[PDB]
Amino acid sequence: SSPQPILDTIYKLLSEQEQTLVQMIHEQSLLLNRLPPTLDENSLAPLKSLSQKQITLSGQMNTEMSALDATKKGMILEPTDLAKLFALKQDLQIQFKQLSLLHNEIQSILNPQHSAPKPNVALVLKSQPFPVVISKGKQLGENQLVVLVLTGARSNFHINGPVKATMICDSHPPTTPLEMDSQPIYPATLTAHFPLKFLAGTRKCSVNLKFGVNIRDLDNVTTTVESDASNPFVVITNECQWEGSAGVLLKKDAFDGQLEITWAQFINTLQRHFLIATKQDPVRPKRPLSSYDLKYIQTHFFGNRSIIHQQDFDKFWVWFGKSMQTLRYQRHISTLWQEGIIYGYMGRQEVNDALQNQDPGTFIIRFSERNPGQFGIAYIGVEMPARIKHYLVQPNDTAAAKKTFPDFLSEHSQFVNLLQWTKDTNGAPRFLKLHKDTALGSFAPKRTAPVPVGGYEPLNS
Amino acid sequence: SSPQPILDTIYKLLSEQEQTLVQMIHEQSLLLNRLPPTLDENSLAPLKSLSQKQITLSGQMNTEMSALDATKKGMILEPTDLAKLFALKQDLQIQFKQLSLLHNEIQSILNPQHSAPKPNVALVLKSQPFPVVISKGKQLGENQLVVLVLTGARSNFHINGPVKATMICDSHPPTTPLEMDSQPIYPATLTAHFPLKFLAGTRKCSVNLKFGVNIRDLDNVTTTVESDASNPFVVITNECQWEGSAGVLLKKDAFDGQLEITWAQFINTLQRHFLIATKQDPVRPKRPLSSYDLKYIQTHFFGNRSIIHQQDFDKFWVWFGKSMQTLRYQRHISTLWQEGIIYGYMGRQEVNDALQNQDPGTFIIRFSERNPGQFGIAYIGVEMPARIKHYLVQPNDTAAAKKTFPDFLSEHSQFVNLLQWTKDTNGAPRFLKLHKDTALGSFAPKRTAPVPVGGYEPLNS
């Protein structure tokens, strides 16, 4: 954590390199129309000097990529730094492709016969909402999926037809999954916005989008140019699949055709997916998996190694995937957990040691380790001597509309003063004894008529 | 209270006077067979000297009666002193009648022509179980109802037939209420034991027994001699009437044809009846109405006066009678109240002031003032700020066999540590915070298999 250096360094590079390519795209096409009918030396001295600058710059661009690729693989990045590495990675990739087309162009001059290069165009995803688990039928925003066309200084070609989107699944083993696959291109920017409509589930299989357009050479040769695959994603048809899809998506994004990945590589991906599940802000998340939650995960499901394997995942998701389906779908859980109301990821010994001798009625809510997707309230009992008593909250305790976990909680005098997970002044998270009613404040049943004074009342309510 | 003097003084008198009558009964009949055929002075000088002793002693006996009658009427007597005044009263009455028959006899000699005297016999109740509320069909013990025949030194008569028991009701406005009404007389003691069998209810009306026997004069004149009425009592036929009967019995014993009685006279009677209701020992009762309970009664139902009226009673019994039906009939209540577990007679302000700032879960059980025969648990709540919350225990909270008040109590985490009414070392009653489970110790559900350790358990049980 705190890779604040590596990244802010690379960000300044990209902002500069961004401007270098502007003056370079101009400098090139300029020095390109000014090349005589033909002549070698005197005429091609300035082009060779450019090629030099390009190759040099290409190299810096390669060092950068490795630097980033190594950070994601070797450092646990905090939410902000994480979202940034991803952003820098995407932009540097584009810069690299841009520079590449300019160079291939200047090269098709200095050293022709080298052949190939094909039409010097390129389709890249300037922005995408993937990865993510999409619910069948939702439609993307007008600026969520934008495709950018990259060219050389001089365009020795024309574009025929619109840019098309094609869904692909490479675990290959009979209709239209998308709506609005064809989009024209904006001139001032050469971009194409795809407000795709997802018309079909994927059957819990990762998927990627591919864009392509037909380019007609200046010699009337038609070539189809395509983009690399987008980030993976899955389309589900019922909130019942969110898990299987989400796990598959996570497993795919995490390992990517590999059997073993670093610990950092793994959690950096999960953190990313965890925030997407809980629909939290990527940069300033209300509550991201903390270092504590990571260690818990690293200990209870991974042997505490700094290298994770393919099959250790299958077991981790059996449990974890459930804890998340609960966070994303069970009413108020997400909100209550993001607040500190529900601690969540904690093991026995830890829940107990955190309660060692507290007034009776003190409790902490966390995830059952044997009952995936379920909570286990650990409270101190009334009976003497007072001992720590755990309670598995079961499905029937909650009911779809009426009793939601927060209702259930304020109905048992056995749950008095909560141990909330609050943030301190040095920002450090802490445990401060609120009162079941104070903490649940925002969820409590709003008393209409004021409190009765004088006779007798019912016991609990 | 503490009339320890008055009574222990009179007790020594009765024990002595008891022996004086022994030597007097002997001295008399002796000096009676030794009286010549007839002669006045010289012969009747010793008889006149006896008559003097008798009259003197009769007088001491009268001072004693008034002394006792005034104590019951002007001093609140504690259980022991109370049972004693009643015992002394009964024995002194008998001594008085005995002495009377001896004197009438010596007088029928010295001053005949004075006429009357009738056969010089007397039937007195040497012992009785009244007052009390009897359940139809029960049968008395062989020594619970004994009748004693008193005579003069010389018996100038014979007894024909057995001693009979006759039930009487003087609120007069078609069969056999008793079994075994006729009993013979034991010679060595001239007593008749009546193990009466109550064959009929009384319809909530006080009743008294009357004993009588036929005596045949030495001149063949037959006279029926009777005893004064026994203490009142009532026979009920169902536990539903215990109240109406008990109140009527209490009202009758308390006032006795009067409209106004002293405060002391009143409570001394209630104390007596209260111990009989709760089936407690008269001398060493586990828990008798305390001075506190008396003041409560004196304040909430009597205007705090030292003189009680007939109609103030009708209202008092409306409530109190119920609190007692609960003590005598509702399961474990009697035991729980006799223990200090249930305090009982306490008013609002008092219940609250006794709880002013106690840990949440602290409670005292007492009688509802608006809900006669019902309990109102006053406990401190969980909610903050913690305030005193009263709860009316209703009939459905309890069920005949399964849930008895003590079960109900140990089922709500809202009732934690009880404020028990315990006795201190100087014997003074006190409030010591036991634990709902410690105090209910003897009633708790006996856990078969030992306490589970390791997983999750249900919330309350």
PDB file of C-alpha atoms in Angstrom, chain A residues 53-165:
ATOM      1  CA  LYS A  53      12.718  10.145 -31.056  1.00  0.00           C
ATOM      2  CA  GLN A  54       9.869   7.712 -31.584  1.00  0.00           C
ATOM      3  CA  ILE A  55      11.908   4.590 -30.809  1.00  0.00           C
ATOM      4  CA  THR A  56      13.385   6.270 -27.760  1.00  0.00           C
ATOM      5  CA  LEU A  57       9.874   7.231 -26.565  1.00  0.00           C
ATOM      6  CA  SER A  58       8.512   3.787 -27.424  1.00  0.00           C
ATOM      7  CA  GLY A  59      11.083   2.450 -24.995  1.00  0.00           C
ATOM      8  CA  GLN A  60      10.042   4.749 -22.159  1.00  0.00           C
ATOM      9  CA  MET A  61       6.492   3.617 -22.847  1.00  0.00           C
ATOM     10  CA  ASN A  62       7.625  -0.044 -22.454  1.00  0.00           C
ATOM     11  CA  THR A  63       9.421   0.616 -19.138  1.00  0.00           C
ATOM     12  CA  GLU A  64       6.263   2.257 -17.882  1.00  0.00           C
ATOM     13  CA  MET A  65       4.058  -0.694 -18.806  1.00  0.00           C
ATOM     14  CA  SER A  66       6.355  -3.155 -17.024  1.00  0.00           C
ATOM     15  CA  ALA A  67       6.549  -0.835 -14.001  1.00  0.00           C
ATOM     16  CA  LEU A  68       2.750  -0.778 -13.787  1.00  0.00           C
ATOM     17  CA  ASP A  69       2.378  -4.488 -14.542  1.00  0.00           C
ATOM     18  CA  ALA A  70       4.818  -5.253 -11.774  1.00  0.00           C
ATOM     19  CA  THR A  71       3.098  -3.014  -9.234  1.00  0.00           C
ATOM     20  CA  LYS A  72      -0.309  -4.666  -9.696  1.00  0.00           C
ATOM     21  CA  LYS A  73       1.500  -7.991  -9.354  1.00  0.00           C
ATOM     22  CA  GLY A  74       3.619  -7.080  -6.322  1.00  0.00           C
ATOM     23  CA  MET A  75       1.858  -4.470  -4.211  1.00  0.00           C
ATOM     24  CA  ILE A  76      -1.436  -4.463  -2.369  1.00  0.00           C
ATOM     25  CA  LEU A  77      -2.966  -1.271  -3.705  1.00  0.00           C
ATOM     26  CA  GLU A  78      -5.514   0.779  -1.797  1.00  0.00           C
ATOM     27  CA  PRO A  79      -8.810   1.652  -3.579  1.00  0.00           C
ATOM     28  CA  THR A  80      -7.576   4.985  -4.966  1.00  0.00           C
ATOM     29  CA  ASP A  81      -4.177   3.727  -6.147  1.00  0.00           C
ATOM     30  CA  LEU A  82      -5.946   0.705  -7.605  1.00  0.00           C
ATOM     31  CA  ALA A  83      -8.425   2.629  -9.700  1.00  0.00           C
ATOM     32  CA  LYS A  84      -5.503   4.767 -10.853  1.00  0.00           C
ATOM     33  CA  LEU A  85      -3.237   1.909 -11.941  1.00  0.00           C
ATOM     34  CA  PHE A  86      -6.107   0.656 -14.046  1.00  0.00           C
ATOM     35  CA  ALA A  87      -6.654   4.105 -15.546  1.00  0.00           C
ATOM     36  CA  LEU A  88      -2.978   4.642 -16.292  1.00  0.00           C
ATOM     37  CA  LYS A  89      -2.656   1.179 -17.795  1.00  0.00           C
ATOM     38  CA  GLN A  90      -5.487   1.834 -20.245  1.00  0.00           C
ATOM     39  CA  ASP A  91      -4.194   5.241 -21.325  1.00  0.00           C
ATOM     40  CA  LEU A  92      -0.597   4.127 -21.708  1.00  0.00           C
ATOM     41  CA  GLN A  93      -1.822   1.241 -23.912  1.00  0.00           C
ATOM     42  CA  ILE A  94      -3.552   3.722 -26.180  1.00  0.00           C
ATOM     43  CA  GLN A  95      -0.528   6.024 -26.276  1.00  0.00           C
ATOM     44  CA  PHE A  96       1.611   3.063 -27.191  1.00  0.00           C
ATOM     45  CA  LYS A  97      -0.681   2.070 -30.105  1.00  0.00           C
ATOM     46  CA  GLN A  98      -0.900   5.640 -31.330  1.00  0.00           C
ATOM     47  CA  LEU A  99       2.876   6.054 -31.368  1.00  0.00           C
ATOM     48  CA  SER A 100       3.151   2.681 -33.068  1.00  0.00           C
ATOM     49  CA  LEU A 101       1.007   3.724 -36.068  1.00  0.00           C
ATOM     50  CA  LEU A 102       3.019   6.942 -36.493  1.00  0.00           C
ATOM     51  CA  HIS A 103       6.257   4.988 -36.466  1.00  0.00           C
ATOM     52  CA  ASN A 104       5.035   2.280 -38.855  1.00  0.00           C
ATOM     53  CA  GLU A 105       4.134   5.151 -41.125  1.00  0.00           C
ATOM     54  CA  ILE A 106       7.507   6.874 -41.038  1.00  0.00           C
ATOM     55  CA  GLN A 107       9.040   3.432 -41.499  1.00  0.00           C
ATOM     56  CA  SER A 108       6.960   2.596 -44.605  1.00  0.00           C
ATOM     57  CA  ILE A 109       9.018   5.433 -46.019  1.00  0.00           C
ATOM     58  CA  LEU A 110      12.575   5.026 -44.744  1.00  0.00           C
ATOM     59  CA  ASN A 111      12.661   1.236 -45.055  1.00  0.00           C
ATOM     60  CA  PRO A 112       9.913   0.022 -47.373  1.00  0.00           C
ATOM     61  CA  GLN A 113      10.139  -3.535 -48.641  1.00  0.00           C
ATOM     62  CA  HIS A 114       9.850  -4.302 -44.956  1.00  0.00           C
ATOM     63  CA  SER A 115       6.310  -5.007 -46.099  1.00  0.00           C
ATOM     64  CA  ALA A 116       3.066  -5.403 -44.196  1.00  0.00           C
ATOM     65  CA  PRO A 117       1.790  -2.777 -41.802  1.00  0.00           C
ATOM     66  CA  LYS A 118      -1.560  -3.217 -43.517  1.00  0.00           C
ATOM     67  CA  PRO A 119      -3.836  -0.168 -43.455  1.00  0.00           C
ATOM     68  CA  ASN A 120      -2.311   1.899 -40.623  1.00  0.00           C
ATOM     69  CA  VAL A 121      -5.451   2.179 -38.476  1.00  0.00           C
ATOM     70  CA  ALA A 122      -6.462   0.881 -35.033  1.00  0.00           C
ATOM     71  CA  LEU A 123      -9.622   0.453 -33.000  1.00  0.00           C
ATOM     72  CA  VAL A 124      -9.175   0.850 -29.256  1.00  0.00           C
ATOM     73  CA  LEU A 125     -11.557   1.046 -26.338  1.00  0.00           C
ATOM     74  CA  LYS A 126     -11.126   4.598 -25.040  1.00  0.00           C
ATOM     75  CA  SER A 127     -13.519   3.673 -22.193  1.00  0.00           C
ATOM     76  CA  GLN A 128     -15.529   0.633 -21.006  1.00  0.00           C
ATOM     77  CA  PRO A 129     -17.699  -0.393 -18.028  1.00  0.00           C
ATOM     78  CA  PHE A 130     -16.180  -3.859 -17.811  1.00  0.00           C
ATOM     79  CA  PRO A 131     -15.486  -5.954 -15.905  1.00  0.00           C
ATOM     80  CA  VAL A 132     -18.928  -6.372 -14.270  1.00  0.00           C
ATOM     81  CA  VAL A 133     -21.930  -8.655 -13.886  1.00  0.00           C
ATOM     82  CA  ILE A 134     -24.784  -7.257 -15.972  1.00  0.00           C
ATOM     83  CA  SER A 135     -28.465  -7.998 -15.490  1.00  0.00           C
ATOM     84  CA  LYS A 136     -30.103  -9.056 -18.777  1.00  0.00           C
ATOM     85  CA  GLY A 137     -31.898  -6.199 -20.449  1.00  0.00           C
ATOM     86  CA  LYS A 138     -30.062  -3.246 -18.933  1.00  0.00           C
ATOM     87  CA  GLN A 139     -28.711  -0.695 -21.386  1.00  0.00           C
ATOM     88  CA  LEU A 140     -25.394   1.102 -21.213  1.00  0.00           C
ATOM     89  CA  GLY A 141     -25.013   4.849 -20.933  1.00  0.00           C
ATOM     90  CA  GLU A 142     -24.134   6.878 -24.000  1.00  0.00           C
ATOM     91  CA  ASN A 143     -20.598   7.431 -22.723  1.00  0.00           C
ATOM     92  CA  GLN A 144     -19.899   4.114 -21.023  1.00  0.00           C
ATOM     93  CA  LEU A 145     -18.558   2.271 -24.025  1.00  0.00           C
ATOM     94  CA  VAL A 146     -16.585   4.474 -26.395  1.00  0.00           C
ATOM     95  CA  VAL A 147     -14.350   3.233 -29.199  1.00  0.00           C
ATOM     96  CA  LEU A 148     -11.526   5.308 -30.604  1.00  0.00           C
ATOM     97  CA  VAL A 149      -9.949   4.996 -34.058  1.00  0.00           C
ATOM     98  CA  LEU A 150      -6.201   5.736 -34.237  1.00  0.00           C
ATOM     99  CA  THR A 151      -4.445   6.808 -37.448  1.00  0.00           C
ATOM    100  CA  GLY A 152      -1.121   7.903 -38.827  1.00  0.00           C
ATOM    101  CA  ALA A 153      -0.318  11.507 -39.731  1.00  0.00           C
ATOM    102  CA  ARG A 154      -1.668  10.947 -43.261  1.00  0.00           C
ATOM    103  CA  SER A 155      -4.653   8.747 -43.965  1.00  0.00           C
ATOM    104  CA  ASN A 156      -4.063   6.562 -46.984  1.00  0.00           C
ATOM    105  CA  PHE A 157      -7.535   5.029 -46.727  1.00  0.00           C
ATOM    106  CA  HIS A 158     -11.278   5.424 -46.160  1.00  0.00           C
ATOM    107  CA  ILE A 159     -13.727   3.789 -43.763  1.00  0.00           C
ATOM    108  CA  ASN A 160     -16.741   1.853 -45.061  1.00  0.00           C
ATOM    109  CA  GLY A 161     -19.679   1.026 -42.846  1.00  0.00           C
ATOM    110  CA  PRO A 162     -20.177   1.531 -39.092  1.00  0.00           C
ATOM    111  CA  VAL A 163     -18.089   0.169 -36.215  1.00  0.00           C
ATOM    112  CA  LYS A 164     -19.536  -3.117 -34.997  1.00  0.00           C
ATOM    113  CA  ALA A 165     -19.679  -4.763 -31.591  1.00  0.00           C
TER     114      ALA A 165
END
